[PDB]
Amino acid sequence: VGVGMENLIISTNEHASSDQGKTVSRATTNSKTDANTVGVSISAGYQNG
């Protein structure tokens, strides 16, 4: 009795995945600011004096 092989079949055990996603968002911002400025200027020249 002998055994002969006629075909070899390979099944790869790899895992494949796919993902699909959607996002919607809304943001609201309120801002409040105050500023203070102090300035000093010195000028000197000759305009008819």
């Binding site: 995945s17 796919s18 996603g21 809304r26 409040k32 105050d34 200027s41 010195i42």
Partner: protein
Amino acid sequence: FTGNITTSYSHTTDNSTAVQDSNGESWNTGLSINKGESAYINANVRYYN
């Protein structure tokens, strides 16, 4: 013939505040498959004599 030279100095102080509110939604779908064992088969059979 008039001329003038001016020198100025300025200092500014500023304070600010801000508040932000955010809301968001998300929706995901995913599908995964194994390439080694992808499906199972069932055979409806009958015997005869």
